[PDB]
Structures are given as structure tokens and as C-alpha cells.
Amino acid sequence: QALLRILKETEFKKIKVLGSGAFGTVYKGLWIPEGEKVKIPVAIKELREPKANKEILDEAYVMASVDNPHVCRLLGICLTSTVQLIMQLMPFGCLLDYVREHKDNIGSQYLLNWCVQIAKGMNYLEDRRLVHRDLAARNVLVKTPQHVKITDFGLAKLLGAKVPIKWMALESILHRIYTHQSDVWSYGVTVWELMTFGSKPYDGIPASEISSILEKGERLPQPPICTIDVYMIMRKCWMIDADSRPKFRELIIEFSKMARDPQRYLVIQGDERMHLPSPTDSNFYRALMDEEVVDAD
Amino acid sequence: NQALLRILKETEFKKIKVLGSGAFGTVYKGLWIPEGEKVKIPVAIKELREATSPKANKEILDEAYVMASVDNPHVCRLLGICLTSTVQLIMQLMPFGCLLDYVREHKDNIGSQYLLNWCVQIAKGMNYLEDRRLVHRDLAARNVLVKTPQHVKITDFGLAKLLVPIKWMALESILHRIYTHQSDVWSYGVTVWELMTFGSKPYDGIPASEISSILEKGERLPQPPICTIDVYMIMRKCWMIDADSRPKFRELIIEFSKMARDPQRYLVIQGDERMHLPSPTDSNFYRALMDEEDMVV
Ligand SMILES: CC(C)n1c(Nc2ccccc2)nc2cnc(Nc3ccc(N4CCN(C)CC4)cc3)nc21
Ligand SMILES: Nc1ncnc2c1ncn2[C@@H]1O[C@H](COP(=O)(O)OP(=O)(O)NP(=O)(O)O)[C@@H](O)[C@H]1O
Ligand SMILES: [Cl-]
Ligand SMILES: [Mg+2]
Ligand SMILES: [Mg+2]
Ligand SMILES: [Mg+2]
Fold this sequence. Notes:
Chain A is of the alpha+beta class.
């Protein structure tokens, strides 16, 4: 309707590759409004290789209609040549790179608040009857360090089908069943990446072996900073019975409760000194970057 | 509320382009690097013409706290300060620049709906300052910024105090240095005359030294080609010698909003029928990219 701008190729230019994935290649780009002299930074995802434009368009309107602070909305599309998706540029990049970069400077407050925020966005997708199919720390963007957003839901659907075996629920691997509860298993793996500061899951276990190890009951290890209460939640996200798994709305509650007493739930050396921004600093960041957090008691 | 003003270290930002200059300083595009991050976030930096002492500096700060407390969608808020020997003011960057340049650059290509809506928005911003008992002292089309073509904001609030534009000034300001909300209304009327002439220079061909004399004799800026009598009478009433005979900003808001509901009745612009006016789709896209903030007839 009014939510998806159909772009002409003259309107924008791709400038520099920012990354790539199973579904396409992301560029930092510029939008040049017609009749204007300005160049506005955007991100453009050019999709890999099917579907008629009407169908892609139908799917694109859904992507354009998500409205939640923890979910990136599709802003515009250009489907003359390839399919190019236009979205807001996030100069901070993805949460996986961010946590690695900052592994010596991230506190329990940030970590548990990101868990809440990602659960909030996934709960929203579930409300909207939308299954992501590809949740991972690489798919969560940093708008500010205090504010992250899920991206790339439903690309899996749009393009059909680099398959992310190590994030997938057992049922998706064996029977290709994808549901909101399989997304819960990926959220579990995503929390595991965060709490290990960006470790690669099952590192040195070939992808082919994953179903077998899971079937035996093997799982990702307890990250050293995690108290057992944290680790128990991840293990619950990885139960064989989909329906046994927590629901996103429950994960929001549980992580929000931990975020109130964060040093009770995560043990980080020097954590007492890593806290959320002062009001002074927060007001500034928002003004510049986030015009669009749970504290300890 | 001190939390509204961020105090910055010289080391966290850099100047990268000159954007312009005025009677109070030079404005730069700059980049802010959050300490410990790799990102470069564009800002506007105004560096004052006057290097100052630690003493003068504390006067500056108390006024900076006021500038930073301004919270309204049509007035720019001061975000940050650096008290380098040369005082620097940090504020959000607007890629579209000032409204004076914008209406000159689009000079006979702007529709009545835009012109009337800018007049509403500037009066809304000034009314907010009047509510707070703050006087701008330097309103002019050069000190209105374009955030998007649909959303303008007054800038430079507080500067004139912190540290003259005769052709924008009320007679009583020229004669006696008296500045009040009603002298700001005089300046608003000149600002509107700027916009309605597409950026003509006021009293062109008349030296500044002679302005008070012509005002005293009852001479006023002339009726712009596009302005109907109803619109011109509003402007003239802003320039009554008796300050309390001038309109209030609250009345200006009402009158211009009324006009904005039937813009072709009040401005007569060749080709107005074919001018761009903004579809919901184009507004959602500008807002998502450039204008997230909580804010048109
Ligand atoms: C230069 C002035 C109008 N300015 C102040 N002023 C200011 C006042 C107090 C504190 C900080 C800034 N804040 C500003 C924030 N943003 C922008 N933006 C902007 C300005 C100019 C330009 N261009 C490109 C087109 N060229 C024809 C002319 C230069 C492009 C973007 N200007 C600002
Ligand atoms: N909107 C954006 N703003 C800034 N960076 C982005 C944006 N979108 C994507 N990126 C970057 O591009 C990288 C990869 O993009 P993407 O095409 O999503 O592949 P992926 O997410 O890494 N893997 P895949 O799970 O297969 O999609 C992300 O990890 C980010 O580093
Ligand atoms: Cl702008
Ligand atoms: Mg992708
Ligand atoms: Mg993706
Ligand atoms: Mg200015």
C-alpha cells in the first residue's frame, strides 16, 4: 500500500559490499530523491536467483508491513533487473561481529537486554504469523549498542532453497518442518553465540554430523559466564519435542527478570564496571541515531 | 536538567567539511566516534567566532543547558558542547540544509501546500519557545532547516544571547535593543516573506543603516507575486509599529492552518496544479530513512 516504495534504478546507486549470505549480497548504497540534490545512505540487498513479480511483490508488502522496534522493516524494492531490497543502513553492523569486537568490554546488562530485545522481535513475528527460518546472531543488527533488531525473516520463504544446519531445530533438519517453535531452537543457539562472545557453534563438527549428535542428546556446552539458570533456558530451547520448548512470550519474561539482577545470572570479570549508558549519554545517542532497556534494581 | 547536554572531549569528533558561516560562527559537518567504537556518525558543529575564558564559559554553559532543554518537533535541540578554547556546539546534521537555500533552489517549482505547511510549522516552533518564555532574536529563513521537504525546524535558538540582522528586526529592536515574543513575530513575518518570494533579499537596494528610517515612515516589504491579500495582510500585521497589535504565534498557527486546508485559494502559483505533493508512500519512505521523530495539513 503506502508501506513499500517501488524504486527506479536511477534513484539509487550501490557503492560498497558490506556482506553476503545464503540469500544475497548487502551493499551500502545511496538514495537520490528525484528533483533533489541530496544523497541519503541506505542498505541494499541484492537477492540471489522462480517467481513472478506479482508474487514477489505480494511477499514484499508483508515484509514492509512489520512494525516493531526490534524488527527491521523492508522500506523499498526495485525489481526491474534483479530483486533489490532497500532498508535502513545500520552502521554498527551485525550483533555477531559486535560481540566479538567487544568481547573484553561487554557487561551482563547488555547481554541480557539483547536477549530480551531479540525475543521481543521474534514474539512480534509470531504474532504476525510469520516464521523467520534463519535467526542467528549474524541476522540481528545493531542500531545502537543499546538497541538491536532482527532482520531477514521470510527471505527463506521468498527465495526457497549455506543452509544453516548448526542453528536449525532437529525437525527442520530431518523433515523440513519450520515453525515458530523451530525459531525458538535458533533463538537458543543465538543466545549461545552472545554469551560466548561470538563462538562458532559445534566448532570442528562437520554439518553432516549435527543431526546425529543431537539425536544422541548432545548439545552446545555451558558458556563459562552463564549461571545454570541461563544455560537451562538454552537447553529448553533445544528439546526434541517442539511443543516442550519455551514460547517467545515466556523468554521475554524470564530474560527481563534476569536483566533486573543481572550479576545474579551472569558472571563477568569487571561487570560491576560495565553498566548501561548514563541518562546523559543515552539522550545523545538517541538524538543522533535512534529517534524511534531494563535496568537493575 | 543537565542530562540533556552532553559535554564532549575534542578527541571524540572531527571536522570534515565547511557547511557555511554566519554572524556567530562557522558551521562544519563533522564525525563523532563513540569512544571504543569503529563507527563515524555525522553531526553539525558550530564553532563560535570568539575564543573564550573559563569564566565566560560558565555563562555559556548555563545558556547551553537551556538550548538543550528545547523539546519540540519544529525546533532544533542543542545535543552537545565542547568547551575548547573555541566553543563548539554539536547538533544533528540536516542533509537538505536551510530553507532559504531550498526555496531558492526549487524557486518556481514548489506548490502552495508546502509553502503554507512550512509557515504552520515555523509558527508551531516559535509558539513553543513563547510558552517556555524564550525569545529567539534571530529568526530568518536562513535559520530554518529542512529535515525533510515535509518537516522543517527552527535552528540557532539561544545564539544571539550567547554572543545584527537589521532587515529582520522589529523597529523597537533596532531603536532600543528591545527583544520580546512580539519582536520575534516581526521576524516571523519577514521569514514568511522570504519563503513566499522564493528567497528574495528583503529591502534589496536599501542599506541597513537606513532601515529604521523607512520603517518609521511606514514603508514595508511588498506583496509577493503569489500572495493573495489574506496572506499579505498577515505579514503586514506582523510588522505593526505597536508590538501588541501584531499577531500572536498561536493565532498564526490557526490562520495558516486554515489556509493550508485550501492552499490554492490563498497562494496563486503558476503550474500549482502539477506541483509535487507527497503521497503517503513517499512520506513513509522519507520518515523511515530520515525522520523517525514524533511530529501536516
Ligand atoms: C550551516 C547551518 C545552516 N547549519 C546549522 N547551523 C547550526 C547552528 C547552531 C549550531 C549548529 C549548527 N546546522 C546545520 C545542520 N545541518 C546543516 N545541513 C546542511 C547545510 C548546508 C549544506 N550544503 C549543501 C548545499 N550547498 C548548496 C550548501 C551547503 C548541506 C547540509 N546545516 C546546518
Ligand atoms: N541493513 C544493514 N545495515 C548494515 N549492515 C547490514 C545490513 N544488512 C545486512 N548487513 C550486513 O551484511 C551482513 C550479511 O548480510 P546477509 O545477507 O544477511 O547474510 P547473513 O545474514 O550474514 N547470512 P544469511 O543468514 O545467510 O543471510 C550482515 O551480517 C551484516 O554484517
Ligand atoms: Cl535534512
Ligand atoms: Mg541474507
Ligand atoms: Mg539475513
Ligand atoms: Mg543557521
